[PDB]
């Protein structure tokens, strides 16, 4: 269990690095966000199962619901970005600097 929790924390760290380092794709950034979400779900589920916290077992379902809501909003914003430009490029959406 501590080795697995270390691996899950490192997986979250990798997905956070993916979120922070952009590569030309808002969709790939959203994918990194949902990878962070999946890592947090697995961490919470493993912790609750190990500690037998059946009262706290609704917590992963709650984070999954709110994470899918935020993924829905991100996909809608990506649709609006694609309608604006046609390429979905984070470097292409840059015109608010002035």
């Amino acid at each position: 269990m501590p080795s697995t929790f270390f691996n899950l924390t490192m997986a979250f760290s990798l997905s956070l690095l993916g979120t922070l380092m952009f590569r030309s794709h808002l969709m790939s950034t959203l994918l990194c966000l949902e990878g962070m979400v999946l890592s947090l779900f697995i961490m919470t589920s493993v912790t609750s199962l190990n500690s037998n916290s059946m009262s706290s077992m609704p917590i992963p379902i709650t984070i999954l619901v709110f994470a899918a809501c935020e993924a829905a909003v991100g996909l809608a914003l990506l649709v609006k970005v694609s309608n604006t430009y046609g390429t979905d490029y984070v470097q292409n959406l840059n015109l608010l600097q002035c």
């Binding site: 379902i61 999954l64 619901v65 899918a68 809501c69 993924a71 829905a72 996909l75 809608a76 649709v79």
Partner: peptide, 15 residues
Amino acid sequence: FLVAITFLLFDLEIA
């Protein structure tokens, strides 16, 4: 596309 996003929300309502 709106039906797909609604499908995401309805899948979590399923969950």
